[PDB]
Amino acid sequence: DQLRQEAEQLKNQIRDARKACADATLSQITNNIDPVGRIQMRTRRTLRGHLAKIYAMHWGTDSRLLVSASQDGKLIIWDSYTTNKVHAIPLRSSWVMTCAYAPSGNYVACGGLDNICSIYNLKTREGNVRVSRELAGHTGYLSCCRFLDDNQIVTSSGDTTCALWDIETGQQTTTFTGHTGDVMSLSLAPDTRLFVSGACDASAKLWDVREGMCRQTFTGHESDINAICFFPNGNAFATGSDDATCRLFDLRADQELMTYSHDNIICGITSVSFSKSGRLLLAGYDDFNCNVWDALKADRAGVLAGHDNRVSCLGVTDDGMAVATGSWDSFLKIWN
Amino acid sequence: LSAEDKAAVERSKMIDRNLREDGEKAAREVKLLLLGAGESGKCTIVKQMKITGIVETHFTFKDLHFKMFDVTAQRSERKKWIHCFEGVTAIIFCVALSDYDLVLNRMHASMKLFDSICNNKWFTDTSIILFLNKKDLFEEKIKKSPLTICYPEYAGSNTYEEAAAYIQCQFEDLNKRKDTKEIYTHFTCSTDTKNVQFVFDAVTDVIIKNNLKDCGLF
Amino acid sequence: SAGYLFLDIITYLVFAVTFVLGVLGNGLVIWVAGFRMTHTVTTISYLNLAVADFCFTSTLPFFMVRKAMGGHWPFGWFLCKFVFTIVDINLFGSVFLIALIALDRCVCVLHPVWTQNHRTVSLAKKVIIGPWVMALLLTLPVIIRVTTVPGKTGTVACTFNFSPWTNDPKERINVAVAMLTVRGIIRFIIGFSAPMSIVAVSYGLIATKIHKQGLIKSSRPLRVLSFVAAAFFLCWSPYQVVALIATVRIRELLQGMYKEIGIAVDVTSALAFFNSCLNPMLYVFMGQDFRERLIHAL
Amino acid sequence: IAQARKLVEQLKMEANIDRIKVSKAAADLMAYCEAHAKEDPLLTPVPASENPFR
């Protein structure tokens, strides 16, 4: 009624400010730069240790160790350089949907349909890997978890709310109820002061770890968001959606700077990532292969087709040396 | 160079053998997906015989290791996590036969759920098992409440002999394909061993179909 | 009144087409199974069958050069030894692998519990070694005595001498007849009584269980089994019966006459060799997934 | 009505945010890329001498 009308008036007011702030297309500014994104990317390494579909993966700070989780029930930490399996952590629940790797490498997270963020410690006196803490406080399935420090973790579940957890404490010290749909992605800023989350309501909302507040909301999509990563600088981020279009938003302009759409693709976008410099964008699609888009010219730079199934999660190493990409074929491939 | 690398390679090979052994054990187990609008009905099936996210129920029947998943405890968007169960052997659908007059329309909600999962791209070749719950109460309830309360096009005598068949026929006609998926409808009984016997017989048929496709004789 | 020339032309054409299509199909199957597809029980069984048939097809030109030269063998004694043992190993392995695949299908259809519980990759690898060891043990007499004896006319032929030392031509003939007849009986038994009957029983049980339980929604499961059984029978049964007939009259055969029996043996051998090349066309290429993966890889 | 009231308060509270020019934001975004273009293994093909992957 009156309250709904006031919300509609506020919605009309905020969009007018964004339109007034906008003066020209962002791609038009970068139309005069030489496009050097045309590269040839091959299969440098192939990893085959999973007996089931891989749903998530994460890179390490040293860019030598990567984690991968599958539906078999095994969490494997791979040595990227030597291909050897450093660790193979069994999982109580085989139905997993996300996994995270600590910046210091001391901890590894795992979440799934059993809505428990089981965190395992890698550096332990015993040879075997034991469970450190089981964060069982969520209602829906965990969809994305990310490590800020060795003591705090942010996990996004399917119950429309995100939560900040502490391994030492074991309880949610911060809860984000601003979303309306099921949150399906997470991405931390380089300084870890703020993060954004993509939900099933086709909107991505910015959050603050220290405050717990929702600074701003982006609603530039008509389909549910499946992945998100911040720009290397941290002033921008890109969200991938099932409508085969992934868009890049800015923390200041707050609208669609670039739009990566092609008429020959209709498959839902599953993974989105940025390189070290952020000039080229790594995007994973549901057409059994991923693609590379120029983050400044909004054109597809190269085609990366080496997987026998759809991509689930792909990540770029911290140093930007090589990008690794998993898939449902139980094969993880590191490409440079 | 070859000193620490050999230890890492040996460690990788040693755990890989364990993964293969664990992978064989995982493939040995047969998986059964469960869901349905009848959240009360599924509890009776699980508790009929001896053996938080989702609940995994593991038991063995006639030298076959069954694995039973309780998904009705999950309340979220189905398409965002239903692809995880793409490799299940056979889905078990539990629906209450007496939910036709509940408002919550309850039977219509289950009908939509049944149609929504039969048309899923992840269950193209996954045959689903059907269980009709509260059969004993259903025959008593139809005497006082006609079955045509929620069915706009029902024309027949209100007796359990043909009313149950009509419900089974209606459910079996919700499939867009009738060759890859075979629905095994059963009438739940008070006997504990008879409830699980149908599951073993149904799973045996599904295993035969998977073996035939794997061997190429399909 | 003599159709020997037309029969020889037919045999040459059959050998050539067998070689080319078997080599091509077996190479494609080996590549797809080893690299494009993951290893499963049926996948590794088909890979083993493809290896066994591909080695035989690769060695087939060494029979082509012998047939073109007739009795004369223009290659070395060690090469003849290697060829005549590898071909026997390939044929025995192919027959035993067909029998093993039939038994595997029978145990998968009749006992789903057993194939769900115990039938895995490791058990498949363990059971695969069986047929190969059995073939090696049965062929051991071929390795022992297949020395390429020369001829008085000038043509040197690869044949079982059966005697390293020739005490007397009559004694050598008698020993050769005895060894040939016992080897023929053993070959006929172990290659037709066990394998063919096991295959027939397995496919009959599969057909009966798929008919008495209504597990077939189409004629394809029955048609494929009938086609493969008929192909195996038509390829091997005439060869086995002709070999048995030759074994019965081996004493008269070794004297020099009965050239008609020899040409019948040759044509039945060609027909049996045709199986080693038509095996991938039915056991592998018939599968929809196999064809789709082969198309995608190419 | 509590959820609706919170949404209305949230929308009005986030209005006071410092906007920046889109062209300036676009120039800032590309400024980082060109500054880090030299140290970009994905953009410039790194030689195999120092490439950890070969």
Author numbering:
A (entry chain B): 5 to 340
B (entry chain A): 5 to 55, 182 to 234, 241 to 354
C (entry chain R): 19 to 316
D (entry chain C): 9 to 62
List sentences from the manuscript.
In response to the N-formyl peptides from microbes and mitochondria, FPRs play crucial roles in host defense and inflammation. Although FPR1 and FPR2 share 69% sequence identity, these two receptors display distinct ligand-binding preferences. In contrast, FPR2 is promiscuous in ligand binding with recognition to a vast array of ligands with diverse sizes, structures and functions, ranging from small molecules and lipids to peptides and proteins, which enable its involvement in chronic inflammatory diseases such as AD, systemic amyloidosis, and atherosclerosis.
FPR1 preferentially recognizes short N-formyl peptides such as the E. coli-derived peptide N-formyl–Met–Leu–Phe (fMLF), and is associated with antibacterial inflammation and metastasis of malignant glioma cells. Furthermore, we also solved the structure of FPR1 in complex with fMLF and Gi to better elucidate the ligand-recognition modes of the FPR family. For FPR1, the flexible C terminus of the receptor (R322–K350) was truncated to improve protein yield and homogeneity. Owing to a spatial hindrance caused by the larger side chains of residues F812.60 and Y2576.51 in FPR1 (L812.60 and F2576.51 in FPR2) and a different orientation of Y2576.51, fMLF moves toward helices IV and V, excluding its contact with helix VII. The FPR1 residues involved in fMLF binding are highly conserved in FPR2, except for F812.60, F1023.29, and Y2576.51 (L812.60, H1023.29, and F2576.51 in FPR2). However, the single FPR1-to-FPR2 swap mutations, F812.60L, F1023.29H, and Y2576.51F, and their combination showed little effect on the binding affinity of fMLF to FPR1.
